[PDB]
Amino acid sequence: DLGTENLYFQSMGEFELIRRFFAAAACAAPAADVALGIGDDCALLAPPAGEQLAVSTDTLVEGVHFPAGCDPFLLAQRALAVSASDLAAMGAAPLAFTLALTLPQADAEWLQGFARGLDAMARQCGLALVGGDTTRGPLSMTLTVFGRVPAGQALTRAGARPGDLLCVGGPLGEAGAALELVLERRSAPAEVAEPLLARYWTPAPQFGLGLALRGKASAALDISDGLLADCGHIARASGVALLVECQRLQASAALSGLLAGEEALRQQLAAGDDYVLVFTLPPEYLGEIRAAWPAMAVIGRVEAGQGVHLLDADGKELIPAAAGYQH
Amino acid sequence: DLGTENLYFQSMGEFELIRRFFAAAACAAPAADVALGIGDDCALLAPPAGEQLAVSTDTLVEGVHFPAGCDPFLLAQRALAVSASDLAAMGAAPLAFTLALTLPQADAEWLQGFARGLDAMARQCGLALVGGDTTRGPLSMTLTVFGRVPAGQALTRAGARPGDLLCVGGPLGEAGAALELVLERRSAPAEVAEPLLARYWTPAPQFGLGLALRGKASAALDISDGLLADCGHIARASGVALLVECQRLQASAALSGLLAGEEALRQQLAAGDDYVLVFTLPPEYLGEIRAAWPAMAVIGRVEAGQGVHLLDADGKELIPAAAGYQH
Ligand SMILES: Nc1ncnc2c1ncn2[C@@H]1O[C@H](COP(=O)(O)OP(=O)(O)NP(=O)(O)O)[C@@H](O)[C@H]1O
Ligand SMILES: Nc1ncnc2c1ncn2[C@@H]1O[C@H](COP(=O)(O)OP(=O)(O)NP(=O)(O)O)[C@@H](O)[C@H]1O
Ligand SMILES: [Mg+2]
Ligand SMILES: [Mg+2]
Ligand SMILES: [Mg+2]
Ligand SMILES: [Mg+2]
Ligand SMILES: [Mg+2]
Ligand SMILES: [Mg+2]
Ligand code: NA
Ligand code: NA
Ligand code: NA
Ligand code: NA
């Protein structure tokens, strides 16, 4: 060979170098049920026979689902956790995900921090990064998550039945409170700020609860938009009434650390971004689910009828004063 | 019942009404191997036993992968087709997809046209729409496509071997030529404009070729960035040299209709957006693949070595005059 006549500078440019932050990420390593990870036109998933693949996609847009200029290490954890919460909402076991990242141009420090946070949440969630896309534009990420669940055992939003208990998998309103700190509308000491901020940036997807509920919950989903709003999805898909007992909404120590009374209750009822499951449960399974997931709480019940109903201590229904208002 | 004490205006707002364009789309109908489509936290896919799920994601950003203000009916077809091309690149049979759509606000006429075009391409591709996400922000779409392929039979980018033929599945450069028309940098009569524009807005994913190549091609991918660039992925993953014979790049009737000589050859070599497969093939399978896919063409060969090599009629290597230039 003479050392000449080689073709270069046709490809493998800036966005290839960006892509390599993810090809080299710890969460891109080989993993169970992944026959082919990053590097080809598709990833290949191989859930053990009899198991279906649960698939969900979520998009986070800069300025909409997270603040501009935020720590990329926290942002990557938040993006993966909120997306992975939908697998828990089905009772699926975590398997893998793809990352479609759009960004204006390379930023090496941003990407290093983003990839490091993605590794941490992925390890926490047991999710392999198996593919993705890297594109130029205003900052955005679309994560598509994959889990496995035996046929017929997925948790669905229909099936809530009158007589069932209405339950949640953990404290509500904490991410809404945390947003007050994130936006610096309020201050707090570390003992208050740290637990709440962890709920905004690193909500733990409730995989264990979803798995515990297989064959037991009559219906479930994860609270992303707000307690009362997401109860409406069960009520409508199941054709029943969901009753929420306002007295059973215990504000957490962390929530009470920053907010009190009505402000706290409003966060519980309507903040969303909780990524805690809401589920309906035949009463015969209460003890088991309490043992499997002690953070769970009964907040109400299911009856024949329509709609979501917030009840005060005397059983009377609470209605916002005007259309569009909240409690 | 008294008709009072009902909770509304907490949810089911503007972006729910946007979402319904897709929940009601024809391509959201029940489909084979889809155990659960739109409506729950995850879709559930059930490929028949022994078959793996091939998964790919692609993002199209307004102004980057399509022009601002373009026909949404054409845009939805383009978005789904370019994403579905990665299933053909694996030899997967099409199954389903999710649509993550980001848009500034509702636009009823845009959405009606977008959903109508998505139905057409989905029917053409045999893809069920099973889930997605709808978010506010600068216009963008991330499509995640799912196909099925028997274990061990997927087409991969490694495995090209010296002695193999280098082939493509159809004419090259047509979408690059079409872009001249899309941007109105050139004019053409309908007999020229219509075939080229169809390649930009409605490239047909080469599912049949990918399926025909199972167990026969030694390596393959789809040309998205450009002939020479994407040949480099096979060369590097397989550890071989790919030789492209410049004389074997026949400009199509449609391509020749608008451009001639070098301008046409440059489109063939570097336009990308072809969404035609490039593949390496043991010579013993040439006749079969020609019969299965008559648009296919031999363009070169594989040898021991490194890199991609463009050769002229005398076998001498063509090199751009300076780094960054193209032929
Ligand atoms: N951000 C990312 N995270 C993880 N994997 C990625 C990412 N971007 C790309 N990939 C993977 O890297 C490989 C190359 O993808 P990519 O670089 O997007 O190809 P491409 O030339 O851009 N063609 P296309 O994106 O399909 O139009 C594939 O296996 C992808 O799944
Ligand atoms: N553009 C879309 N195309 C197809 N299906 C969609 C689309 N947007 C949402 N879906 C589906 O519609 C159902 C409701 O999703 P969605 O309205 O996004 O829930 P959400 O309240 O916004 N929670 P989340 O998106 O997970 O934070 C699910 O089954 C989704 O997969
Ligand atoms: Mg490809
Ligand atoms: Mg979601
Ligand atoms: Mg790409
Ligand atoms: Mg959900
Ligand atoms: Mg692609
Ligand atoms: Mg949504
Ligand atoms: Na989802
Ligand atoms: Na979302
Ligand atoms: Na892909
Ligand atoms: Na892409």
From TrEMBL, chains A, B:
<dbReference type="GO" id="GO:0009228">
    <property type="term" value="P:thiamine biosynthetic process"/>
</dbReference>
<keyword id="KW-0784">Thiamine biosynthesis</keyword>
<dbReference type="Pfam" id="PF00586">
    <property type="entry name" value="AIRS"/>
</dbReference>
<dbReference type="GO" id="GO:0009030">
    <property type="term" value="F:thiamine-phosphate kinase activity"/>
</dbReference>
<feature type="binding site">
    <location>
        <position position="325"/>
    </location>
    <ligand>
        <name>substrate</name>
    </ligand>
</feature>
<feature type="binding site">
    <location>
        <position position="86"/>
    </location>
    <ligand>
        <name>Mg(2+) 3</name>
    </ligand>
</feature>
<feature type="binding site">
    <location>
        <position position="157"/>
    </location>
    <ligand>
        <name>ATP</name>
    </ligand>
</feature>
<dbReference type="GO" id="GO:0000287">
    <property type="term" value="F:magnesium ion binding"/>
</dbReference>
<dbReference type="InterPro" id="IPR036676">
    <property type="entry name" value="PurM-like_C_sf"/>
</dbReference>
<dbReference type="InterPro" id="IPR010918">
    <property type="entry name" value="PurM-like_C_dom"/>
</dbReference>
<feature type="binding site">
    <location>
        <position position="65"/>
    </location>
    <ligand>
        <name>substrate</name>
    </ligand>
</feature>
<dbReference type="InterPro" id="IPR006283">
    <property type="entry name" value="ThiL-like"/>
</dbReference>
<feature type="binding site">
    <location>
        <position position="225"/>
    </location>
    <ligand>
        <name>Mg(2+) 5</name>
    </ligand>
</feature>
<feature type="binding site">
    <location>
        <position position="224"/>
    </location>
    <ligand>
        <name>ATP</name>
    </ligand>
</feature>
<keyword id="KW-0479">Metal-binding</keyword>
<comment type="pathway">
    <text>Cofactor biosynthesis; thiamine diphosphate biosynthesis; thiamine diphosphate from thiamine phosphate: step 1/1.</text>
</comment>
<dbReference type="Pfam" id="PF02769">
    <property type="entry name" value="AIRS_C"/>
</dbReference>
<feature type="binding site">
    <location>
        <position position="58"/>
    </location>
    <ligand>
        <name>Mg(2+) 1</name>
    </ligand>
</feature>
<feature type="binding site">
    <location>
        <position position="58"/>
    </location>
    <ligand>
        <name>Mg(2+) 2</name>
    </ligand>
</feature>
<feature type="binding site">
    <location>
        <position position="41"/>
    </location>
    <ligand>
        <name>Mg(2+) 4</name>
    </ligand>
</feature>
<comment type="function">
    <text>Catalyzes the ATP-dependent phosphorylation of thiamine-monophosphate (TMP) to form thiamine-pyrophosphate (TPP), the active form of vitamin B1.</text>
</comment>
<feature type="binding site">
    <location>
        <position position="133"/>
    </location>
    <ligand>
        <name>Mg(2+) 1</name>
    </ligand>
</feature>
<keyword id="KW-0067">ATP-binding</keyword>
<comment type="similarity">
    <text>Belongs to the thiamine-monophosphate kinase family.</text>
</comment>
<keyword id="KW-0808">Transferase</keyword>
<dbReference type="InterPro" id="IPR016188">
    <property type="entry name" value="PurM-like_N"/>
</dbReference>
<feature type="binding site">
    <location>
        <position position="41"/>
    </location>
    <ligand>
        <name>Mg(2+) 3</name>
    </ligand>
</feature>
<keyword id="KW-0460">Magnesium</keyword>
<keyword id="KW-0547">Nucleotide-binding</keyword>
<feature type="binding site">
    <location>
        <begin position="132"/>
        <end position="133"/>
    </location>
    <ligand>
        <name>ATP</name>
    </ligand>
</feature>
<feature type="binding site">
    <location>
        <position position="86"/>
    </location>
    <ligand>
        <name>Mg(2+) 4</name>
    </ligand>
</feature>
<feature type="binding site">
    <location>
        <position position="56"/>
    </location>
    <ligand>
        <name>Mg(2+) 4</name>
    </ligand>
</feature>
<protein>
    <recommendedName>
        <fullName>Thiamine-monophosphate kinase</fullName>
        <ecNumber>2.7.4.16</ecNumber>
    </recommendedName>
</protein>
<dbReference type="GO" id="GO:0009229">
    <property type="term" value="P:thiamine diphosphate biosynthetic process"/>
</dbReference>
<feature type="binding site">
    <location>
        <position position="222"/>
    </location>
    <ligand>
        <name>Mg(2+) 3</name>
    </ligand>
</feature>
<dbReference type="GO" id="GO:0005524">
    <property type="term" value="F:ATP binding"/>
</dbReference>
<feature type="binding site">
    <location>
        <position position="273"/>
    </location>
    <ligand>
        <name>substrate</name>
    </ligand>
</feature>
<dbReference type="InterPro" id="IPR036921">
    <property type="entry name" value="PurM-like_N_sf"/>
</dbReference>
<feature type="binding site">
    <location>
        <position position="86"/>
    </location>
    <ligand>
        <name>Mg(2+) 2</name>
    </ligand>
</feature>
<feature type="binding site">
    <location>
        <position position="57"/>
    </location>
    <ligand>
        <name>Mg(2+) 1</name>
    </ligand>
</feature>
<keyword id="KW-0418">Kinase</keyword>
